[PDB]
Write a protein that binds this ligand. Sequence first.
Ligand SMILES: [Mg+2]
Ligand SMILES: [Mg+2]
Ligand SMILES: [Mg+2]
Ligand SMILES: [Mg+2]
Ligand SMILES: [Mg+2]
Ligand SMILES: [Mg+2]
Ligand SMILES: [Mg+2]
Ligand SMILES: [Mg+2]
Ligand SMILES: [Mg+2]
Ligand SMILES: [Mg+2]
Ligand SMILES: [Mg+2]
Ligand SMILES: [Mg+2]
Ligand SMILES: [Mg+2]
Ligand SMILES: [Mg+2]
Ligand SMILES: [Mg+2]
Ligand SMILES: [Mg+2]
Ligand SMILES: [Mg+2]
Ligand SMILES: [Mg+2]
Ligand SMILES: [Mg+2]
Ligand SMILES: [Mg+2]
Ligand SMILES: [Mg+2]
Ligand SMILES: [Mg+2]
Ligand SMILES: [Mg+2]
Ligand SMILES: [Mg+2]
Ligand SMILES: [Mg+2]
Ligand SMILES: [Mg+2]
Ligand SMILES: [Mg+2]
Ligand SMILES: [Mg+2]
Ligand SMILES: [Mg+2]
Ligand SMILES: [Mg+2]
Ligand SMILES: [Mg+2]
Ligand SMILES: [Mg+2]
Ligand SMILES: [Mg+2]
Ligand SMILES: [Mg+2]
Ligand SMILES: [Mg+2]
Ligand SMILES: [Mg+2]
Ligand SMILES: [Mg+2]
Ligand SMILES: [Mg+2]
Ligand SMILES: [Mg+2]
Ligand SMILES: [Mg+2]
Ligand SMILES: [Mg+2]
Ligand SMILES: [Mg+2]
Ligand SMILES: [Mg+2]
Ligand SMILES: [Mg+2]
Ligand SMILES: [Mg+2]
Ligand SMILES: [Mg+2]
Ligand SMILES: [Mg+2]
Ligand SMILES: [Mg+2]
Ligand SMILES: [Mg+2]
Ligand SMILES: [Mg+2]
Ligand SMILES: [Mg+2]
Ligand SMILES: [Mg+2]
Ligand SMILES: [Mg+2]
Ligand SMILES: [Mg+2]
Ligand SMILES: [Mg+2]
Ligand SMILES: [Mg+2]
Ligand SMILES: [Mg+2]
Ligand SMILES: [Mg+2]
Ligand SMILES: [Mg+2]
Ligand SMILES: [Mg+2]
Ligand SMILES: [Mg+2]
Ligand SMILES: [Mg+2]
Ligand SMILES: [Zn+2]
Lengths: 91, 98
Amino acid sequence: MKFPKSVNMYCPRCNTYTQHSVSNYHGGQRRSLAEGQRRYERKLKGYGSTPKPKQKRFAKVNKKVTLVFTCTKCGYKIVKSLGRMKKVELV
Amino acid sequence: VKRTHGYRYKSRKLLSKAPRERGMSGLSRLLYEYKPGDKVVIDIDPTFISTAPHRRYQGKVGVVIGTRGRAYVIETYIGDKKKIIITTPEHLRPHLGG
RNA sequence: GCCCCUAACCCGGCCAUAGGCGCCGGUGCUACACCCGGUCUCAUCAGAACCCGGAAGUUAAGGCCGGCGCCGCGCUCGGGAGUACUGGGCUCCGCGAGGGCCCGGGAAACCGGCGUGCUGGGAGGGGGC
RNA sequence: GCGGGGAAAGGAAACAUCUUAGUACCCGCAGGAAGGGAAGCCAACAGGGACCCCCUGAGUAGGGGCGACCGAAAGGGGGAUA
RNA sequence: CUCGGCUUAGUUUUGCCGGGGGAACGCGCCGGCCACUGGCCGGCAAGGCUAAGCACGUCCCGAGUCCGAUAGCGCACUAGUA
RNA sequence: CACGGGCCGGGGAGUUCACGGCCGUGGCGAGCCUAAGGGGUUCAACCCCGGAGGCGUAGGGAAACCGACAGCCCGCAGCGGGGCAACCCGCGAGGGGCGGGGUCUUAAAGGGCCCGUAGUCACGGCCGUGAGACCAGAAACCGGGCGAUCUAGCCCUGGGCAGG
RNA sequence: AGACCAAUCAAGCCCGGUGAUAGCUGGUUCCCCCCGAAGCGGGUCUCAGCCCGGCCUCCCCGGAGGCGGCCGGCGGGGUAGAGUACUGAUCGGGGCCCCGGUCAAACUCCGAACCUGCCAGCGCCGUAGAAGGGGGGAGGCGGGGGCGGUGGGGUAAGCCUCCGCUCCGAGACGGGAACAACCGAGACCGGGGUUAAGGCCCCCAAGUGCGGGCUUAGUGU
RNA sequence: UGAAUCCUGGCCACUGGCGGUACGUGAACCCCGGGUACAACCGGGCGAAGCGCCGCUGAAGGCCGGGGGUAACUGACCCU
RNA sequence: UCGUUGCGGGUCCGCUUACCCGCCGCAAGGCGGGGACAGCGGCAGGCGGGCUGUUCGGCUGGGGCGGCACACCCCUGAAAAGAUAUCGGGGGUGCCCAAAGCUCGGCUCAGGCGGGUCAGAAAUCCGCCGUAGAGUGUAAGGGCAAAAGCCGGGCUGACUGGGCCCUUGAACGCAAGGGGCCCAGGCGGGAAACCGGGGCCUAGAGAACGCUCGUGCCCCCACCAGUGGGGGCCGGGCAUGACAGAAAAGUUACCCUAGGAAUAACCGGCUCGUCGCGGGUGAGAGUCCCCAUCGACCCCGCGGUUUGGUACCCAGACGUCGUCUCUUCCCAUCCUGGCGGUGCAGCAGCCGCCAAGGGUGGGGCUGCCCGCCCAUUAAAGGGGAACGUGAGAUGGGU
Ligand SMILES: [Mg+2]
Ligand SMILES: [Mg+2]
Ligand SMILES: [Mg+2]
Ligand SMILES: [Mg+2]
Ligand SMILES: [Mg+2]
Ligand SMILES: [Mg+2]
Ligand SMILES: [Mg+2]
Ligand SMILES: [Mg+2]
Ligand SMILES: [Mg+2]
Ligand SMILES: [Mg+2]
Ligand SMILES: [Mg+2]
Ligand SMILES: [Mg+2]
Ligand SMILES: [Mg+2]
Ligand SMILES: [Mg+2]
Ligand SMILES: [Mg+2]
Ligand SMILES: [Mg+2]
Ligand SMILES: [Mg+2]
Ligand SMILES: [Mg+2]
Ligand SMILES: [Mg+2]
Ligand SMILES: [Mg+2]
Ligand SMILES: [Mg+2]
Ligand SMILES: [Mg+2]
Ligand SMILES: [Mg+2]
Ligand SMILES: [Mg+2]
Ligand SMILES: [Mg+2]
Ligand SMILES: [Mg+2]
Ligand SMILES: [Mg+2]
Ligand SMILES: [Mg+2]
Ligand SMILES: [Mg+2]
Ligand SMILES: [Mg+2]
Ligand SMILES: [Mg+2]
Ligand SMILES: [Mg+2]
Ligand SMILES: [Mg+2]
Ligand SMILES: [Mg+2]
Ligand SMILES: [Mg+2]
Ligand SMILES: [Mg+2]
Ligand SMILES: [Mg+2]
Ligand SMILES: [Mg+2]
Ligand SMILES: [Mg+2]
Ligand SMILES: [Mg+2]
Ligand SMILES: [Mg+2]
Ligand SMILES: [Mg+2]
Ligand SMILES: [Mg+2]
Ligand SMILES: [Mg+2]
Ligand SMILES: [Mg+2]
Ligand SMILES: [Mg+2]
Ligand SMILES: [Mg+2]
Ligand SMILES: [Mg+2]
Ligand SMILES: [Mg+2]
Ligand SMILES: [Mg+2]
Ligand SMILES: [Mg+2]
Ligand SMILES: [Mg+2]
Ligand SMILES: [Mg+2]
Ligand SMILES: [Mg+2]
Ligand SMILES: [Mg+2]
Ligand SMILES: [Mg+2]
Ligand SMILES: [Mg+2]
Ligand SMILES: [Mg+2]
Ligand SMILES: [Mg+2]
Ligand SMILES: [Mg+2]
Ligand SMILES: [Mg+2]
Ligand SMILES: [Mg+2]
Ligand SMILES: [Zn+2]
């Protein structure tokens, strides 16, 4: 499905409708100082089996389309999902 | 296979209309101003099915408790449980038995 | 200002007894139309339509009313028919699938007959308070 | 009693991290007890004042397929007091 | 300080062992739940001892809503015997 | 024609602790109880002391932080009035509802939790969880020790195999 | 040859961890009295287990209504049947239409019996306590028989899987020749009487009972 | 593999082993840059074996079909 | 790769004392060679069933293979309230669409007919008819005609913060998801009414921990303040399809434990599709002539003599094929007795009826049963008895 690169959308910070640029959400890189990550390094030290489950069977074919909308006035970012479907083409 | 339970899962005969009742339905049911305390019959209109109550409430009698914008809040029972139906007047009729 | 009666007009309710085909009429001061033009508001390829301004003509058509035939339709009417089917009981029949009896309910098609919009509010018109 | 080496069964309704458990068991070394013991402490700007053991703090903080389960310390009350 | 490992409630923060690196000096050094900076507070590691108050039961003494010879310790007896 | 028992005697199975819920009673009551321990005793009993601590009295929120009722209505019992009575009337603890308040979220409204009193200590009972956990029952797995008089293999050193 | 390693070997033996665990199997000890189930729904590495509801029992609060039956008023439905008009199948006659004919779990103009919602009443239950609510303890979560839905499936099955009443499980007793659930019927103890189902020639209590007709096959009882 | 005797055919695609120029990838260490009054942290570089890639090996484990038709079953034909 | 690892010289060369290897010697020490390499310790990558621990789901007309009836949706089953199962029947789902979403307005669709240059069955044009016979993304069912369809104009409500209700989940506990009615903020369409929190309706759906992103003049981090960093509350996402969510391959005939008739194999029970046997019919054959002898197409039965279906009993156990031995029973009769028919001249043969007293044998082949064959014979029938009979045998097969 095709999506426009800019929309007119309500802004909670501005309390009105402003132009929003449309981009694809990209997940951040996992940082080594995250608390769960630090715990996972502590578990990984020493002898033993693999200490955590790793998924081997997957069933989802597509991920939910997560898009990022940025207000052109203040910079407020809204992240909305369009539902599980193939990757949109920003147009 | 066990019964599927969609919101309208055995509604072929319920939602069907005879040939003489085809098309738009009359607007007289929109013009009944129900108060709190009056008795109404839940009679589902197949042409406005998006706002209709479930098939289990067809033919049942409730008590108008109030209005929510344009819908009527109706108190009814299913066997022993007290249910709250919020439907527009197009799926209602006045009860003339008491 | 008020109560009463009353066409065609406006707003409805039920949405064919209201629909469809054909035939024979009535209606014209007012009202409804057809009708006459496109300066203005408004519109399209097109003043056909929509919108605007009007009043020479016409009941030819639409509308409304009356009658007849056909199709369709409606009926709490007669026959079909207490039939088909059915709730309850049975040490009642049948090899059996099934059927019978008693108590209680009870159609449909079809055939014949009848009917072919009814009605609410307002305008206009008449009467009286 | 002190130091070191060190499981599994079972539990988690499977099982590997985990628990069981620093346990069973093994090796070494003492005493009538052992070990600990005299602030490079705890606290919070108010003060405690070596140590051990008992009651409590407390299944609290926290650890943990944050699951099962595991789990203090300071402080307070005592025995005794060097 | 860093890497590996065992352990600990110790969690970017317990203790330790191993490999590698590696101070300062009382004008110094250490601690105050991640690190550093400033203040403030508390202290002086890497040397040794220490009674009392606490565990145990071969053994001795006393007690018992304990058992009473198939019970109670395996053994009431020429039982750790045949 | 499912399995167990030849017979008789004796033996033979819901225990205890900790924690939690609840019940039946008892004490005290906006408070309740002491733990360890201490003194005395006719000496594990008993009397006295010991309030540390635990639970309750206030909740909301992740946290910083903030921190609460007698107003109204319905109404059982009960009470008072009437009535021959039936019943009617008024007040009405407890109960129900509404309102008001404390706090969180929100821009707000709305919404969540809480608020106008009862706890606590004990004894007996039931149940849950752990502990062996009503009694009996594996095949297994791990730790430390024992075994090559048997047997498998090999090494050192002896004996044996008529007759054709 | 997975042979043998002290009657032990697809990994010895002894003692210990250890009373290992066991949703599985066996056993589980005195009397009387009151009430009295279930094998259904959902979830679960769930299908021989367990949890949340339904069904049981006990206690308490609550306070006047309740509903396995019936009549009526006002409503809902789309089955049996019916039809062949929508969607389809299907045989003939006549000129894409008309007429007659055969069908439909996944066709429907019509349409019961019946079931179900509210109200009023009758009936019964209820202040010796309806509705509603709280607390404890469960069992049980394998069901089965008869009848009815031509239930749906299957050649059929004492077959598989649903729906409802009743009965057995957990219910004595009479009849059925025996026989959990077929008919009658619901049992504190003793006695007397009368009946139910069914029976009355003997076995066996009660009739070689009554009228009419049929059967010659010991058909049948 | 299993006396002796006559013999032991084609195939390295796969599973292995082994050898190899370059190149890609490839851990720690180390180095560079950023960040941090210091660290944690973040980006990059270098880059062993091995893997990828290239060969050799069947008395290594072994494998050994077809499609067809043409052809006067096919000697022969195209090969695929 | 870090250390061992040293001494000279210009990363490379050399040296010996380290270290290592052998020889001699009780040792002391000497000889030779290698040499800061090697070897050794730590760390890191690779190969690594050599060894250690484990997992190898469920439903199921027994298990297995298959299927997914394992999470969902529509029609039917379903018995006119509600609910309702089977490895029941017909199908679909894990999407797609910036327009196929919102609103406003105009129009009318399939198809048919008449007229019209190219032009035609079908293009664009004029008119008449046209109940939807079209279209509405996608299964099925439902809805829809000045529309819910087609065309055009203007937009992004597929919106921010919240509440209530319905369904999933009947009465009656209980996720996620989905739908409805609203309050506030700010918009779009429209004259307004009114509508818009995706698709006309019923499917397209995912807990805890962890990570990531957005958001707040936001809260916390241990004596105080600051910097970096970390944690928290609210919301979107990354996934468990076995879809109320473990991270998981075989084999055992060498096998072991606990149970189970909740569940198969043998026998038994029920059933009889299959198997064997009987009957009705008579097209047709039989020189003519249905029925001497048959018997198409069809139909009604019986037995329990094959095979299956079911899973009622039996897993602390009913000894699994055949044969030998021995006894009895049935008749649906192969011979022997009686009778009839004939397409019965005789000899023979074929068919039916009564009849179970007696007989029904000897060999070759195969573990067989069965079947075929050989020479005879009056003929060399077939079945039941826990597929009679293993506390009688045998042991060829399995
Ligand atoms: Mg269900
Ligand atoms: Mg919608
Ligand atoms: Mg144990
Ligand atoms: Mg386990
Ligand atoms: Mg296990
Ligand atoms: Mg000694
Ligand atoms: Mg001492
Ligand atoms: Mg000492
Ligand atoms: Mg521990
Ligand atoms: Mg004695
Ligand atoms: Mg003794
Ligand atoms: Mg048994
Ligand atoms: Mg016995
Ligand atoms: Mg337990
Ligand atoms: Mg194990
Ligand atoms: Mg061992
Ligand atoms: Mg020997
Ligand atoms: Mg073998
Ligand atoms: Mg042996
Ligand atoms: Mg072994
Ligand atoms: Mg042992
Ligand atoms: Mg009773
Ligand atoms: Mg059992
Ligand atoms: Mg009624
Ligand atoms: Mg029918
Ligand atoms: Mg019919
Ligand atoms: Mg019904
Ligand atoms: Mg069951
Ligand atoms: Mg039944
Ligand atoms: Mg039972
Ligand atoms: Mg009897
Ligand atoms: Mg008698
Ligand atoms: Mg007879
Ligand atoms: Mg070869
Ligand atoms: Mg070296
Ligand atoms: Mg090395
Ligand atoms: Mg292995
Ligand atoms: Mg699995
Ligand atoms: Mg299974
Ligand atoms: Mg399968
Ligand atoms: Mg229904
Ligand atoms: Mg429209
Ligand atoms: Mg569900
Ligand atoms: Mg329910
Ligand atoms: Mg759709
Ligand atoms: Mg869904
Ligand atoms: Mg502090
Ligand atoms: Mg599930
Ligand atoms: Mg069975
Ligand atoms: Mg059998
Ligand atoms: Mg047959
Ligand atoms: Mg014949
Ligand atoms: Mg059979
Ligand atoms: Mg039996
Ligand atoms: Mg037996
Ligand atoms: Mg036996
Ligand atoms: Mg005969
Ligand atoms: Mg047998
Ligand atoms: Mg036999
Ligand atoms: Mg035998
Ligand atoms: Mg025998
Ligand atoms: Mg043999
Ligand atoms: Zn903005």
